[PDB]
Amino acid sequence: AKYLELEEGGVIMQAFYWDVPGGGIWWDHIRSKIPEWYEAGISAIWLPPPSKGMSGGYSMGYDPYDYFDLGEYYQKGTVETRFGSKEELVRLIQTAHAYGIKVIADVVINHRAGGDLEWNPFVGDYTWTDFSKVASGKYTANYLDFHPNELHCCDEGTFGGFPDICHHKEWDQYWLWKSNESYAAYLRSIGFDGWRFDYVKGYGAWVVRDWLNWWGGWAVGEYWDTNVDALLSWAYESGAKVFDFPLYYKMDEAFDNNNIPALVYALQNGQTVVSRDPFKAVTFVANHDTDIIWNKYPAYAFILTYEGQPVIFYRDFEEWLNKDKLINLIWIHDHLAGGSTTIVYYDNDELIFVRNGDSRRPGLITYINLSPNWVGRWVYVPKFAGACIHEYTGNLGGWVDKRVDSSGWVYLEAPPHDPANGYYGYSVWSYCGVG
């Protein structure tokens, strides 16, 4: 990648959103963006589930039917998936790799959908568990491969009424990751580097752990919950990272309601994954399932200058927000955002913190303002004592430099938070001359 690599905590782009334009144009559409995203500093792209789903052309991939059909067989009323054909996906991955950008596969293995009606001896009724007709002829299945069966009735969880996969069966283990004919093998064979595990609360952490033991690669599990202990327990057991839903909700509490203290408190008392283990936290401002944060500018300013590994939501970058502001924060994240964090000021609508720097990144000062007016504060930042600091976003309307006296005191300023009028509510500072 241009700046930091995925394995180095680089920024990730969720290259989709709920119900992207159909017609099989998504893979090509994303492929055309690779050169721009490379220049923007994106280190990896997370793609939606690539397999043929029950709802065919309308499927978002979360109702997988034939895992081994990436848009190559006429099935469920279509050859290509909603996103495109197999080759288009392969070409996308090849283009990403040509630019050193990694690709993350969205693995949906808790459930399956689109099976034929079949008598189920354990349910005592008919179930849509007959998957013997999948066009790929790979990973066929019947009621024995789902809950309930002769092993047990249920596992950690189900999703709606979709046939719930029993990973304890060797047949299913073989087809999903335990062989060179597995779904993991197939995804890896076409270029996928990492994994994003869907609804991990629906099955055991051991599944992800064994998958990773066999294939390695960067990984994150989607464990939708606010209980940090539960998320970190799953993370340490599975060996994968977890999306920081706890931080997501706390950022919303603070940034969308002039309640910064709510976020400070959460960060101080372990109510976020990132404040407990920044090496396990995958941070985000929004995703395809939930998007409650309205004031996204200070939110992105925060996850891109604070600790953890940030993800940028496709729609914010390509449709709703000022792309240049995001490109700027990615540059800042990879060049300045390093080291431990020290909060130096806060009130209901303002948050100022310092990143103390690491071996490659000098550190920075983030000044978030949720108020509708220009603000300025005298702050004690000994980290930058006796230095020339520069504002790196340009949100002050121009090129601005300041001298932090030998003591550590400096008068910092932040623009109004009125994005509707081009005032984004944040300024970011660091040593002059970095980039």
Ligand X SMILES: OC[C@H]1O[C@H](O)[C@H](O)[C@@H](O)[C@@H]1O
For residue 291, state whether it binds ligand X (rule: CB under 6 A): yes
Identify the residue among 63, 69, 106, 155 touching Zn ion (CB under 5 A).
155
CA distance 119 to 129: 9
For residue 202, state whether it binds Ca ion (rule: CB under 5 A): yes
Question: What does 166 bind: Ca ion, Zn ion, ligand X, none (CB cut-off 5 to 8 Å by kind)?
Answer: Zn ion
Q: Which is nearer to Zn ion, 370 or 387 (CB)?
A: 370
DSSP annotation of 230 reads: H
For residue 258, state whether it binds Zn ion (rule: CB under 5 A): no
Tell the burial category of 123 from Cβ atoms under 10 Å away from its Cβ (0-12, 13-18, 19+): middle
Tell the burial category of 366 from Cβ atoms under 10 Å away from its Cβ (0-12, 13-18, 19+): buried
Q: Which residue is nearest to ligand X (CB)?
A: 291
Q: Cβ 74 to Zn ion, closest distance in Å?
A: 13
CA distance 432 to 336: 11
The residue assigned the tokens 């913190």 is 353
CA distance 308 to 16: 22
Question: What does 168 bind: Ca ion, ligand X, Zn ion, none (CB cut-off 5 to 8 Å by kind)?
Answer: Zn ion
Question: What does 252 bind: ligand X, Zn ion, Ca ion, none (CB cut-off 5 to 8 Å by kind)?
Answer: Zn ion
For residue 431, the tally of other CB atoms under 10 A from its CB is: 16
Residue whose C-alpha is closest to residue 150's, from 163, 168, 130, 126: 168
Candidate segments 12-20, 246-254, 397-405, 410-418, binder of Zn ion by CB under 5 A: 246-254
User: β-strands 12-14, 44-46: how paired?
Assistant: parallel
For residue 145, state whether it binds Ca ion (rule: CB under 5 A): no
Q: Residue 154, CB half-sphere, CA atoms under 13 Å: how many?
A: 7
Where would I find the beta strands (DSSP E) of 246-396? 281-284, 309-313, 341-346, 350-355, 364-369, 375-380, 387-391
Q: Which is nearer to ligand X, 17 or 177 (CB)?
A: 17
Question: What does 203 bind: ligand X, Zn ion, Ca ion, none (CB cut-off 5 to 8 Å by kind)?
Answer: Ca ion
Give residues with Cβ within 8 angstroms of 314, minimum separation 6: 13, 14, 15, 16, 17
Question: What does 24 bind: Zn ion, ligand X, Ca ion, none (CB cut-off 5 to 8 Å by kind)?
Answer: Zn ion
Q: Which is nearer to ligand X, 18 or 236 (CB)?
A: 18
Q: Which residue is nearest to Ca ion (CB)?
A: 202
CA distance 170 to 130: 18
For residue 198, state whether it binds Ca ion (rule: CB under 5 A): no
Residue whose C-alpha is closest to residue 370's, from 326, 406, 335, 419: 419
The encoded tokens of residue 362 equal 């000098």
Q: Cβ 320 to ligand X, closest distance in Å?
A: 4
Q: Which is nearer to Ca ion, 178 or 201 (CB)?
A: 201
For residue 203, state whether it binds Ca ion (rule: CB under 5 A): yes
CA distance 69 to 131: 13
The encoded tokens of residue 401 equal 């430099």
Question: From residue 154 to residue 173, what is the string marking binding to Ca ion with x (rule CB under 5 A)?
Answer: -x--------x---------
Question: What does 85 bind: Ca ion, ligand X, Zn ion, none (CB cut-off 5 to 8 Å by kind)?
Answer: Zn ion
Cis peptide before 298 (omega within 30 of 0): no
For residue 320, state whether it binds ligand X (rule: CB under 6 A): yes
For residue 291, state whether it binds Zn ion (rule: CB under 5 A): no
CA distance 5 to 37: 13
Question: What does 256 bind: Zn ion, ligand X, Ca ion, none (CB cut-off 5 to 8 Å by kind)?
Answer: Zn ion
Alpha helices in 77-204, H assignment, sequence order? 86-98, 170-176, 183-189
CA distance 194 to 287: 18
Q: Which is nearer to ligand X, 7 or 19 (CB)?
A: 19
Q: Which is nearer to ligand X, 286 or 344 (CB)?
A: 286
Question: From residue 240 to residue 279, what is the string marking binding to ligand X with x (rule CB under 6 A)?
Answer: ----------------------------------------
For residue 209, state whether it binds Zn ion (rule: CB under 5 A): no
Question: What does 26 bind: ligand X, Zn ion, Ca ion, none (CB cut-off 5 to 8 Å by kind)?
Answer: none
Q: Which is nearer to ligand X, 175 or 300 (CB)?
A: 300
For residue 63, state whether it binds Ca ion (rule: CB under 5 A): no
For residue 347, state whether it binds ligand X (rule: CB under 6 A): no
**Residues found near Ca ion in the complex (CB under 5 A):** 110, 155, 164, 202-203
**Residues found near ligand X in the complex (CB under 6 A):** 286, 291, 316, 320
**Residues found near Zn ion in the complex (CB under 5 A):** 24, 36, 84-85, 155, 166, 168, 252, 256, 292-294, 347, 349-350
